[model samples]
Target chain A: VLLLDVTPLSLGIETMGGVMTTLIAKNTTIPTKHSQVFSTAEDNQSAVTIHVLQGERKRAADNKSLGQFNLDGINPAPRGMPQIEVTFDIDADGILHVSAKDKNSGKEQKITIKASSGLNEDEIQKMVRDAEANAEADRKFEELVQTRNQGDHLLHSTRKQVEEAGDKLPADDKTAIESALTALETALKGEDKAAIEAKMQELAQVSQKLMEIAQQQHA
Target chain B: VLLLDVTPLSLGIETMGGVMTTLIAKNTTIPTKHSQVFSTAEDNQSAVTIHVLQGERKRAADNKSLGQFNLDGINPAPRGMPQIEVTFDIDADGILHVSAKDKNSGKEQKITIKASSGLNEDEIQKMVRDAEANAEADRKFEELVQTRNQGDHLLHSTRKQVEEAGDKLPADDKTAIESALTALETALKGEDKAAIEAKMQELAQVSQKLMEIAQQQHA
Candidate 1:
């Protein structure tokens, strides 16, 4: 796995011997947080679903699901009014830890989420403590995410030179250029980072030609 | 001011003793690209307003934006049909990088998304070059964004990543359950990762029930 862009997904190989889970997933913007508010969808029901999914999946059941969390104690008054909150925190090491709370009473709830990759609590705790003393992984993680995102989008000097020229190109030429760019963007949104990288290469070439054509048009 | 679980906003303060310009606005994801197809809003129109924004604002001008980019290459197409793609990729280090492409032609159009904060190619190039050579930072940035999205949203503990439960969780925790998880998810979307982290500490207490309820519902 040639590490790819940042998007809350781990990009690593299932390394041999498992000797170490090396720094496969890189550069994560650290100390990051995400939250969303949910309310009861059913009336007279004091319960709701809070499914936390992992990997690519259309449903909760199909993925390497990390965990499924739910919320309880709806007002029982009716549907759509009971308020719930969920937050996920990512430390400098790119480790994701999450939390939940009730808005009404300032009370704490439960957090049973897990990675589901067969990793246990003792191991996780040990890593956390190690990271706490010194956040070596955290720093590296942040750096990895930053570099990839910036580096990935940048074009080589040649590509830049071409783009400097304007948009007076042949229709067919424009079609190819547009297709490659679309392909790159589409691939990134999907699960394959390597594919996206590959597309960027193709786009860069067409981009160079586009530049030349623009120059000629001006002349 | 606290450096808690804040949503990693794409902003770089004057780290090298200068104005740190912001890249992408808040609330956008990394390696995530968006393309909008724009056309002549009026008959025989030649240009369209390409207003780019960052931060939260109903209109483009109100936001601390990265200025406007104009796109012209029209053929008197009807309004709202001219295709234009504007992509915003907020990388892990919280820097926003952008790329755009014209959908009509296969030719390369103009794409010069520069940094607003007095940063030039040479300086930015140095840091980026060094970063790419390092490899570790790139990895982390990718991991963080990936983690944010797939991040064991339901964090299953692992040898490298995990959390422990406190001995004092409240009983009848019904009221407490939903809020705990909600708080974490809600706060995560913020710009500052630090603030989110602070909220996470408060959320640690009731991490169990929220998830358990969800599992039961699905089960």
Candidate 2:
């Protein structure tokens, strides 16, 4: 009698920003193969460490390490310039064979590991639940970060425009832009992504009005 | 400022019976080194795969794999006969260096991995709690297995003795021994460790009585 099996946990690698970049997701049928191209994280990097991991965590630091190897002899290039293709192959016996090839130099390294997560059915199920529970929180945090970045960008650009159009703009317009910038800065400091986005919109509108005023003065 | 840090998770290797034999436990101060001896699981095995893992689980299948490599060139030997010394060294930076040396053939292999469990502080705390919760159940289960094995041994020995003195024992004593043997066998099938032990004691006493009756007959 033949029985089908699935991976109990997600199989991934550590990518830039210490993120868990999953090549083969959990529940993927066995005897599967996946390949992904990655680049160096730093400039003039001659070697890339392919750190294999497994788990449901978003950060590689929170996942379980499988194995790691260094693929060297890369043509020294700026960050994200060199292409390195890493492949993960799982055989019928659930043995994981990982290989990395430096596209420039063709230097390859391989490591084979028995893909045993040491987790039983209950543990695997718990991990899946935990991943689901944390997913929403993680997504919100990521959105907050992105929104805060937008707020910061808008605040700085508005401030710069106001400063360059100093005295060329009405005092009231300058005051409005300054207040909106302050509000956006405060929103960025806070945890609410929606608030930060709202503040950014407010600053952008005021800045647009200031720009119109400056243009009229120039005309 | 020399700030001390400890390992967030335990480091171990897969051993016989797919058990996670912890080499370095979690929360150990950094820059630590540990060595352990392991042997082949199969007779006449020439190569031993060293699978390194991390976690708090008792079974290697439940833990996270760190990395693995093979220490070949082992002198073909019976299982558990060859001495293979595996060493784990973690530096201050939390990088883990693992080495395995086969004493008989002097063959050695090494793999280095960053000691990253990919777990944040909150996750680590949760794992610690989970481990504590599972500890009692795991201990009880282990005790149960050991007790069951003991009961099996005693049952077999008692049966053999009764069979050897089959015709020599009185009919009443033979019936008593048979009843006790049946009881012990039934208890062994159940999950209660204490019940199995109690039944084993009962069988041992009856078997002792039968032995005495046999000795008197011989005398």
Candidate 3:
């Protein structure tokens, strides 16, 4: 039995200026838990009203309002002084439970999701497929970024070492290091991820050898 | 030499009606990347505006608007037809790079944050300490919840087994099981955490013994 299901839309609470602050992201696996700490924005504010909602829109008014409650037992203090720890827990049955604890007073308030979406399994599966298909490109882009970052680090390290050492390195080692740097720079500009990756590996080896020679000579 | 820092607030995007969809959470270590898939909400919609924001508010109007960009070249489609992939990457220098791509047309749009907060090291350190101090209570509460949940599961399992087995259980074992259940119920009502925990442990042993006896008799 599938005791857990993914959230159909994001779940959040209404903060200042009618903004909906997401507590749980859309499509996140259910039975998930997250918490955030917020402070009173006004001096001597005794009650904090948490308006629960569900939607993908950027405004709380556009989203479906689930419920709201006031955590009233807070100790009066200046703005941004009393911390209220809000915990959101989504259970296996797709229900959202919220608990707000006043850090200053140790008093707690709780609420549960009474309103939600009605999308069934088939619809959920379709949404999942759409998201997964779209995410593939993001995965590739991330890999490219990661490879380029690694290549950049190796290039910087090599450049810095040689620049600091000046003419201290042996002639052959300096030529090899400079050549590897050029190859890495060109690869970084190229679109081919594989080529960049290979160049990074070669640059790593060259830099390692150069560093060893520099250390051996200077020390 | 610490190039990386923490986010002062959760970074997110504004969806319809100013609903904020968080990409990176507040206080998360920098140099983070996150992506989400969004769909056209109206028929024949050819563009989507990605509104980046920073705050702990529920509405985009309340939070500081970091930036916004229109992802053009999206193929005109009915509501929820065209997929728009949005990615956010924050570097160690607190620069935020946002990219929005239209899945249908393979068109891309990009933006970068040029300026941001300048909270000094001491202020950031103070905020970190304040959050850490508040989180301690939350940690203990989480532990209490976990222990309570475990106790509930055991109580349910024990109750189910006894109910189903009925008179099949030997007379002495049945009375002992009933007595244990009553004790667990009383302890659950009590406020002492240690007492409840001890009761849970004892109940676990009782349930185990009950299960063994039942198996022996049935076998």
DockQ (CA atoms), all models: 0.03, 0.01, 0.01
CA lDDT of every candidate:
0.39, 0.75, 0.64
lDDT of 3 at A43: 46
lDDT by residue for model 1 (B95-198), tens: 44544455444322333344343234464445445544655533333333333322123222110011112223245553454454466566555433444444
Please report, as a residue range, the 10-residue window in candidate 3 chain A with the lowest summed lDDT.
A210-219
lDDT of 3 by residue, A40-77 (tens): 65545778998887765555675667788999965544
Better of 1 and 3 by lDDT: 3
Clashing pairs in 2: A61-B118, A61-B119, A62-B118, A62-B119, A118-B60, A118-B61, A118-B62, A118-B63, A119-B61, A119-B62
What's the TM-score of every candidate structure? 0.27, 0.36, 0.31
Runs in model 1 deviating more than 4 A are A1-45, A56-62, A76-82, A87-99, A105-219, B1-50, B53-219
Residue B1, candidate 1: alpha-carbon lDDT:
39
Candidate 2 iRMSD in angstroms: 18.6
Point out the higher-scoring one by TM-score: 1 or 2: 2
| Best lDDT among the predictions, by candidate number | 2
Against the hidden true structure, what lDDT does model 1 obtain?
A: 0.39
Error (Å) of candidate 1 at residue A22 is: 22
| Candidate 2: tens digits of C-alpha lDDT, residues A89-181 | 988777888899988888899978774533555565676787788998666655666666566656665666676676777877778888888
Predicted candidate 2 versus true structure: per-residue lDDT over B1-219, tens digit per residue: 001245667887887545678898875665789999887766688888889887787666766677799988878675668999999998866788899998887889998886453455566567668778899876766677668767776776667667778677778778888898899989988889889989888877767677685567558
